[PDB]
Amino acid sequence: SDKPVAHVVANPQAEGQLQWLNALLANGVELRDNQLVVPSEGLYLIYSQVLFKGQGCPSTHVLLTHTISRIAVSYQTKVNLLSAIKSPCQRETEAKPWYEPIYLGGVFQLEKGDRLSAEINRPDYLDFAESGQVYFGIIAL
Amino acid sequence: DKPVAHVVANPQAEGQLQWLNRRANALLANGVELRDNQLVVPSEGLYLIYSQVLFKGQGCPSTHVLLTHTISRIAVSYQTKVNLLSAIKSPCQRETAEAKPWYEPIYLGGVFQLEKGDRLSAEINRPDYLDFAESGQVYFGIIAL
Ligand SMILES: Nc1nccc(N(Cc2ccccc2)c2ccccc2-c2cccc(-c3cnc(N4CCNCC4)nc3)c2)n1
Numbered sequence: 001s002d003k004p005v006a007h008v009v010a011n012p013q014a015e016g017q018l019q020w021l022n023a024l025l026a027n028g029v030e031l032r033d034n035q036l037v038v039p040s041e042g043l044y045l046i047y048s049q050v051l052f053k054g055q056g057c058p059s060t061h062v063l064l065t066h067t068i069s070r071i072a073v074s075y076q077t078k079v080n081l082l083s084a085i086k087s088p089c090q091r092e093t094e095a096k097p098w099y100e101p102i103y104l105g106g107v108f109q110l111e112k113g114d115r116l117s118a119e120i121n122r123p124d125y126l127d128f129a130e131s132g133q134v135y136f137g138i139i140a141l
Numbered sequence: 142d143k144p145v146a147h148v149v150a151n152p153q154a155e156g157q158l159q160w161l162n163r164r165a166n167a168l169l170a171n172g173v174e175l176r177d178n179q180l181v182v183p184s185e186g187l188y189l190i191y192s193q194v195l196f197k198g199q200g201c202p203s204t205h206v207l208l209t210h211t212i213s214r215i216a217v218s219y220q221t222k223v224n225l226l227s228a229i230k231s232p233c234q235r236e237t238a239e240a241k242p243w244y245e246p247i248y249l250g251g252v253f254q255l256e257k258g259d260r261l262s263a264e265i266n267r268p269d270y271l272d273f274a275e276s277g278q279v280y281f282g283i284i285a286l
């Protein structure tokens with residue numbers, strides 16, 4: 001009847017950084033310090049997504065990450081929940097572009113007041129222009 | 142209180158992808174047993190299913206490197222392995238003066254009718270190319286909808 005849920009999205013203007021905005025947070029969940037703040041204990045369904053693009057390809061090796069992290073009330077420690085890593089640049093270019101999305105999602109026990117980050121190593125290579133399909137969200141079960 | 146489960150790779154085990162529930166941020170609730178490396182469904186229903194793996198490689202030895210990931214189901218009554226989800230990735234079009242590492246994740250998933258006592262199985266062909274360097278890089282769970 002009041003099952004916690006949240007879904008947020010990126011900020012296209014924010015000069016090289018993944019700021020989560022214009023926010024659909026319901027039934028307790030908050031967005032504080034760019035971090036989904038849980039409102040109660042239980043079983044939750046946690047996902048996210050981010051998108052990349054680079055013109056050409058630089059020879060110094062390009063390595064793109066994404067990571068959802070739990071900061072538990074139990075230990076105040078930044079535990080990795082979901083994470084991925086990508087190698088767009090294998091060959092240098094001609095100078096033609098490339099695009100690469102990353103998405104994560106799992107079911108997770110969470111506790112009253114656990115904070116959840118969602119971050120990336122290289123905000124400079126974001127592709128904000130793709131109708132803003134760079135999101136983050138959670139859902140109680 | 143619906144059956145669910147989320148299990149991650151054991152970082153100890155080398156030449157295999159062993160799933161673990163008894164870890165930080167992993168679980169099995171309401172009858173989703175883990176046995177013979179397989180998730181096991183307590184009762185019949187619509188289930189969300191998903192899995193992720195990640196293949197690091199330290200340079201391209203050759204072009205013919207070929208990575209797979211697959212989630213399959215083995216119903217009791219029928220008994221054969223029915224593939225559900227599937228991926229093939231050849232991450233080396235040409236061998237790389239220096240190595241220059243290459244990563245390659247594979248996320249799979251969908252929503253699937255399951256019978257009681259079905260045995261889901263998320264597997265790969267090259268666990269030598271796995272990456273446990275950081276946590277949360279390799280998992281496999283279900284949720285009853
Ligand atoms: N990350 C992601 N985003 C959107 C949805 C989503 N869900 C579904 C959900 C979401 C809310 C309430 C209920 C079901 C999951 C949530 C938790 C755990 C697991 C999944 C989950 C399962 C199976 C498949 C996927 C999935 C998603 N996105 C792709 N992308 C789309 C773009 N184009 C390339 C393919 N592919 C597969 C995701 N997860």
Ligand SMILES: Nc1nccc(N(Cc2ccccc2)c2ccccc2-c2cccc(-c3cnc(N4CCNCC4)nc3)c2)n1
Pocket residue numbers: 007141286
């Ligand atoms: N990219 C994306 N990725 C995941 C979900 C998602 N959407 C859908 C969407 C897609 C395109 C454009 C607009 C809306 C939503 C996005 C934001 C907020 C909400 C939804 C959203 C919509 C419709 C249904 C649901 C939904 C999920 N899960 C359950 N169940 C309840 C019973 N327990 C098991 C879970 N029920 C409903 C969720 N979009």
